[PDB]
Design a protein around this ligand. Structure first.
Ligand SMILES: O=c1[nH]c(-c2ccc(-c3nnn[nH]3)cc2)c(Cc2cccc3ccccc23)cc1O
Ligand SMILES: [Mn+2]
Ligand SMILES: [Mn+2]
Ligand SMILES: [Mn+2]
Length: 200
């Protein structure tokens, strides 16, 4: 079929807020999303996985972790995760500092993606088009915070997480994997997938 434009895909297939946060960050970093389009789509995908990981997960009135997908989470529920990804650098470190003061967890060397108030740890999310184990070791070797939990997703359903501890239930991780499958399938229908996969 005809070859689409990755920019069109990104704008048509990610929520405008995700697209905007990705666009702003690339621009501040000197990278043009109109040129580095495969990177644009990968940054949107990663940011969306961060949001989906956190979606619907609350700490209840008693302090247990519960899932609330309906529109109204009762007012006394607390969001289970803090989202650090998607914030500019100042706000991201401000949040990381606030967490570390509230909880006493030690401060990471690089910005992680999430903080889990139930498991009391920062999380680094990865999304890859290559093998998860090779991607996992790269991430671990970059940060080696050894308290930051690492959770890797691929576009074909494979996952790898620190100490075989996957944090979330299978239904939440299936939502994420189903979304990644949908992204890959739509890219492939637009003949974008080949360039996207090999671009990592
Ligand atoms: O884990 C994280 N990953 C990524 C990430 C980065 C690049 C790509 C990619 N894919 N193809 N080309 N580039 C994918 C994800 C990111 C995004 C990211 C990290 C560092 C500096 C960035 C500068 C500007 C905008 C985004 C930036 C964050 C992650 O936790
Ligand atoms: Mn809320
Ligand atoms: Mn990040
Ligand atoms: Mn990440």
């Amino acid at each position: 079929g005809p070859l689409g434009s990755m920019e069109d895909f990104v704008r048509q297939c990610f929520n405008p807020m995700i697209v905007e946060l990705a666009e702003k960050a690339m621009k501040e970093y000197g990278e043009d999303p109109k040129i580095e389009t495969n990177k644009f789509a990968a940054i949107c995908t990663h940011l969306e996985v961060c949001f989906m990981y956190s979606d619907f997960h609350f700490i209840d009135e008693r302090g247990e972790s519960i899932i609330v997908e309906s529109g109204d989470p009762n007012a006394l529920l607390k969001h289970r995760f803090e989202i650090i990804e998607g914030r500019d650098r100042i706000m991201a470190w401000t949040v990381v500092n606030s967490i570390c003061n509230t909880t006493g967890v030690e401060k990471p060397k690089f910005l992680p993606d999430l903080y889990d108030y139930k498991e009391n740890r920062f999380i680094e999310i990865g999304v890859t088009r290559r093998e998860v184990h090779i991607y996992y070791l790269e991430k671990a070797n970059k940060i080696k915070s050894e308290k930051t939990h690492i959770h890797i997703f691929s576009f074909t359903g494979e996952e790898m997480a620190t100490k075989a501890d996957y944090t979330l239930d299978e239904e939440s991780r299936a939502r994420i994997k189903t979304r990644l499958f949908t992204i890959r399938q739509e890219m492939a229908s637009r003949s974008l997938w080949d360039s996207f996969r090999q671009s990592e």
